[PDB]
């Protein structure tokens, strides 16, 4: 599935 | 260059409490997501906690819930771990690491996932009758 | 959780060999497994990402190939400071981690 994104940006 | 230089670490008893801290430089700490992670020799490495860039959002391992705290402090570059209620299996190293994207950089879309990079020098904690 | 396992667990190399080291995971996790490095007294040093992309820095010699539940890292030419233990992560569900490969000196 994966994890979500924990930054303040996608890259 | 970046950098986590952890501490806090040391011998308790258990039921007792400890605070580890984790200051980075050479990044944009307030960019990034950071973790919590611990290693023992039988066990191995073990996932303990994430926060959010910002701390609007944190979730932990199961067998630290209702004793671990993760935060963090932006304006002092720094991370925490309250550890309290310390239990003898708690004892291990601790080391913070920093989230990242684990996938091309230049890459955005819906097949991403998250994982961490760059950890600290670690620091030992011992939970002892 | 997903349980990794890494074969063997020690394994003995000399200079020059090319050595690979094996993850199997419990359920499938596409493509999202990192590789560590660590030395005794040392944290933990990032290696490789989605299975197979280099984290810049790393020399050209290691490289990685995988997907599903069966992943490989492979030193083409193994040099005295890659004597360490190796461990696989997935990171498609929360973070676990195999139980490490030390790579020893063979005599």
């Known amino acids: 599935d994966g994890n979500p994104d924990p930054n303040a940006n996608p890259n | 260059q970046v950098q986590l230089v952890e501490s806090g670490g040391g011998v308790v008893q258990p039921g007792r409490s400890l605070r580890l801290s984790c200051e980075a430089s050479?990044?944009?700490?307030?960019?990034?997501?950071m973790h919590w992670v611990r290693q023992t020799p039988v066990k191995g490495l073990e996932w303990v906690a994430i926060?959010?860039?910002?701390?609007?959002?944190?979730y932990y391992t199961d067998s630290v819930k209702g004793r671990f705290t993760i935060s963090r402090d932006n304006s002092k570059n720094t991370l925490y771990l309250q550890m309290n209620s310390l239990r003898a299996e708690d004892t291990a190293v601790y080391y913070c690491?920093?989230?990242?994207?684990?996938?091309?950089?230049?890459?955005?879309?819906?097949?991403?996932?998250?994982?961490?990079?760059?950890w600290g020098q670690g620091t030992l904690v011992t939970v002892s009758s | 959780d997903i349980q990794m396992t890494q074969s063997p667990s020690t394994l003995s190399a000399s200079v020059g060999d090319r050595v690979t080291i094996t993850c199997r995971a419990s359920?499938?996790?596409?493509?999202?497994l990192a590789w560590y490095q660590q030395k005794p007294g040392k944290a933990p040093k990032f290696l490789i990402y989605?299975?197979?992309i280099l984290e810049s820095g790393i020399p050209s010699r290691f490289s990685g190939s995988g997907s599903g539940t069966e992943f490989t890292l492979t030193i083409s030419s193994l040099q005295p400071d890659d004597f360490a233990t190796y461990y696989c992560?997935?990171?498609?569900?929360?973070?676990?981690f195999g139980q490490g490969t030390k790579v020893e000196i063979k005599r």
């Open positions: 926060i959010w860039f910002d701390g609007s959002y944190k």
């Open positions: 050479g990044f944009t700490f307030s960019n990034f997501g």
């Open positions: 359920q499938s996790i596409n493509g999202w």
């Open positions: 690491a920093r989230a990242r994207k684990g996938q091309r950089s230049d890459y955005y879309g819906s097949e991403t996932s998250y994982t961490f990079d760059n």
């Open positions: 989605k299975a197979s």
């Open positions: 992560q997935q990171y498609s569900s929360y973070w676990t």
